[PDB]
């Protein structure tokens, strides 16, 4: 196909001898930049009712999307739906806009397929992606309507005496503009602190007109302890959040990474965090007796990692480090390939797939 052509040439060729000319965050700041301007090939892959899943009160025309962390400030969202994303989410943002860490902040190890990054939460802030994303809120009704919807995840700034405070505040500025929010947990007196928490980011949604009212999600690390994950699944549970992101980056270092820059500070993205990712979401599936919706991301570059994650609880994806390596056509490649497996699997669409190898 001229599909398959456009895969090899950006994966064998193409982004190979552009990450070798540019410094990955220079790679990231002109993708944002392209990615904003549209310069990207046209639809070459026409979404099958296969891929369509329906979840956190939207239909998703596919099931790929794009993880945080491309989009920090919502720049791109509408050339992200171009390139074929099902979904997409921005952030993190945080409340006052931040720099984040000094440079270098992200280190590619093209032999295993991963990143390492410590960007540390730069962000534009609430109030400038607050108005980046009311100047198209009309274009973005629509298609969510159309199936496209929209994620924000929140941060917190990095001086905060009060996280909850943050969170709350990206709630109220950004809730209204999102068909999802997310908010990042770690390592949790600390499943008190985490239902407090929640409780407060659930009350702010609650009070939205219900027409600007979002899902809530928690996002977590593949790090936690099992006690982590008890405690999580519970707190959950108890007070009706809508759905998990399983997982952000990791700070293991698997053995067998052989990058040069392996020993940078940083969360880990990309190949060697798939199967971490995916048996996490495995655990917390089963934590949650599947009634909690997941977004499984960690290491997607295929259809079959894909499908490993959906099978395993997922019912929707995400990715971002693959495109790092294949560039734009991974997107067109990963629905392709999961399309061709669900027919192989005997599965009628994604939907049927969802948590399979628990069944
Ligand atoms: C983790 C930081 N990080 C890194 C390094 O670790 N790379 N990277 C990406 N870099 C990209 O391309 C660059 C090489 C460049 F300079 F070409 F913009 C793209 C990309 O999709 N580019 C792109 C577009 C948008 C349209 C048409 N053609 C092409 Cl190649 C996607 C990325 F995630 C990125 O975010
Ligand atoms: C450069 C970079 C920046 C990221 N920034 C964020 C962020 O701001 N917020 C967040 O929740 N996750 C962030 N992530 C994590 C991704 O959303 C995703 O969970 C993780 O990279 C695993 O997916 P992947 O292996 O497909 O990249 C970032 C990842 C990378 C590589
Ligand atoms: O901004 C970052 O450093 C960052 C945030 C996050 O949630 N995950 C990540 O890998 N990096």
Redesign the pocket.
Known sequence: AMATGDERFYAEHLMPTLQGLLD?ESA?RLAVRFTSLGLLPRARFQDSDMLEVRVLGHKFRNPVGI????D?HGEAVDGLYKMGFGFV?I??VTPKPQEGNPRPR?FRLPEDQ????R?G?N?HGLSVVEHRLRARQQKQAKLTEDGLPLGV?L?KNKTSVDAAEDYAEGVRVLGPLADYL?V?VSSPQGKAELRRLLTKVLQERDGLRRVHRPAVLV?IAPDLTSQDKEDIASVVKELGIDGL?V???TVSRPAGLQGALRSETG?L???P??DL?TQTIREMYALTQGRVPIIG?????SGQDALEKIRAGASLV???????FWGPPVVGKVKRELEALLKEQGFGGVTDAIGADHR
Do not use: D, M
């Open positions: 990955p990231h993880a945080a962390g491309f920090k989410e952030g993190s992200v991963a990143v390492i990054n960007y939460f962000s995840n941060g997310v990042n996002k992101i997982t952000n980056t969360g993205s990309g190949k965090l798939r990712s991301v960690g290491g997607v570059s995400q990715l971002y480090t693959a495109l790092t």
